[PDB]
Design a protein around this ligand. Structure first.
Ligand SMILES: Cn1ccnc1Sc1cc(C(=O)Nc2nccs2)c(N)cc1F
Ligand SMILES: OC[C@H]1O[C@H](O)[C@H](O)[C@@H](O)[C@@H]1O
Length: 451
């Protein structure tokens, strides 16, 4: 106890955690570099070298004329595969039935055949629970990975992200993989009419409640954004009229060195232990796949410096992935009595003091604040770019957001919004959380696409 020595340990911790700070000027630098890469990704000349791919989605404004009725929506992009029946009407969208399926490890890191076979199995199971596999529903596929589109319903997987590794997928038409798997099962038929990124689905789902929503952002397992770009700026697609949603794939920012001065030892460790070393470096500063692991490595450093847990780390603390991102949220939700923090740490086989709990909270805050601030630089770059491309002095825009980090973290949202606003003078940015965004957004796109 000896409060003096507790205080001294906390001072040393603060000196270590100071490394996570980003000054406003740092964020502006990141924002500018992001904007520079966004410009590069949109240009024919530089697209292939661009770290931020700015992928055209073939989701066009505004548009005109939607089909109505029942749509099946799929969502692949986390550990769970989701199937949803959505009714589209008048255009509104309502989730009518839904099921989530845990993807077996063997299917996420096995072959694309196994993965898409499992997907097809789940679709079959869902269509049977609700008596509908003979009805032919138009199908919208939210597929939350970088895809080079040829059209709304055709595009090649560029590379897996977020730990996905299924062989025989990269370079192939993802809709083709899905269609092939459905055919290889042969107990239901579906017209796959659209494939969209989760950012895009999120953005679209927010549109009907707020027509000013022209940005979608995900801060979940991964982190990405899309936005409505002027067709004249989308050099990768023919035509200069109207707007098309662009999937930034900003998670890959830094993959060509753009973040190097900001990457810490912890970031290097996360990256090197990941399924995609050297890739998705910006996302690895922010996404929930990585945030808890960053905290875990910070704690291990503090343990190594004899600042935490008597310098002894439990088996669990030394287990990859054991500090779940949800624990970061839960730690930062602690009311001050250290109870939630104590429970997490005790469950991790630790015997934490009050000071240990306080230090863990600081580590969590340091990592999640950096995530919020880094993320803000990306969103600010996008919004500032849109303002510039457009013809009003104050841009009022809405950003639709989904993802467990943004939605569930007690403080990320607040820090993120504040930082975005500091970075976006002359913008008025409304943030809306999507409600069943993937499923409803995919259906809404499908309801236009299936014409
Ligand atoms: C976000 N915003 C604002 C104005 N236009 C847009 S984008 C948008 C696009 C679609 C849409 O389905 N567009 C398609 N383009 C090609 C096939 S479907 C939609 N169904 C709803 C939308 F809001
Ligand atoms: O799920 C959020 C994001 O995760 C990753 O960054 C994927 O590459 C991207 O496509 C997706 O939007």
């Amino acid at each position: 106890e000896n409060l003096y020595f507790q205080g001294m340990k906390k001072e040393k911790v603060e000196q270590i955690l100071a490394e996570f700070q980003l000054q406003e000027e740092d964020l502006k630098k990141v924002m500018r570099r992001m904007q520079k890469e966004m410009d590069r990704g949109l240009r024919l000349e530089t697209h292939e070298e661009a770290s931020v791919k700015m992928l055209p989605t073939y989701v066009r404004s505004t548009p005109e004329g939607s089909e109505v009725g029942d749509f099946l929506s799929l969502d692949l992009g986390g550990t769970n595969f989701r199937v949803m029946l959505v009714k589209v009407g008048e255009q509104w969208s309502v989730k009518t039935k839904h099921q989530m399926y845990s993807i077996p490890e063997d299917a996420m890191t096995g072959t694309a055949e196994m993965l898409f076979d499992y997907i097809s199995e789940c679709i079959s199971d869902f269509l049977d629970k609700h008596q509908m596999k003979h009805k032919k529903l138009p199908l919208g596929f939210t597929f939350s990975f970088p895809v080079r589109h040829e059209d709304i319903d055709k595009g090649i997987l560029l590379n897996w992200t977020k730990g996905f590794k299924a062989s025989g997928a990269e370079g192939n038409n993802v809709v083709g993989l899905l269609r092939d798997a459905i055919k290889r099962r042969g107990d239901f038929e579906m017209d796959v009419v659209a494939m969209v990124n989760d950012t895009v689905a999120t953005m679209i789902s927010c549109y009907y409640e707020d027509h000013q929503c022209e940005v979608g952002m995900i801060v979940g397992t991964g982190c990405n954004a899309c936005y409505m770009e002027e067709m004249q700026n989308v050099e990768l697609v023919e035509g200069d009229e109207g707007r098309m949603c662009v999937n930034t794939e900003w998670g890959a920012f830094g993959d060509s060195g753009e973040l190097d001065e900001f990457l810490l030892e912890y970031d290097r460790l996360v990256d090197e232990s990941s399924a995609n070393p050297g890739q998705q470096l910006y996302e690895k500063l922010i996404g929930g796949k990585y945030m808890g692991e960053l905290v875990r490595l910070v704690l291990l450093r503090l343990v190594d410096e004899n600042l935490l847990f008597h310098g002894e780390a439990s088996e669990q603390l030394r287990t990859r992935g054991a500090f779940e991102t949800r624990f970061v949220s839960q730690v930062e939700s602690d009311t001050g009595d250290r109870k939630q923090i104590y429970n997490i740490l005790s469950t991790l086989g630790l015997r934490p003091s009050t000071t240990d709990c306080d230090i863990v909270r600081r580590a969590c805050e340091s990592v999640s604040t950096r995530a919020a601030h880094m993320c803000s630089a990306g969103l600010a770059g996008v919004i500032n770019r849109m303002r510039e491309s457009r013809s009003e002095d104050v841009m009022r825009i809405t950003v639709g957001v989904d993802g467990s980090v943004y939605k569930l973290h007690p403080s990320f949202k607040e820090r993120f919004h504040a930082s975005v606003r500091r970075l976006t003078p002359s913008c008025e940015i409304t943030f809306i959380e999507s409600e069943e965004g993937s499923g409803r957004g995919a259906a809404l796109v499908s309801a236009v696409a299936c014409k």
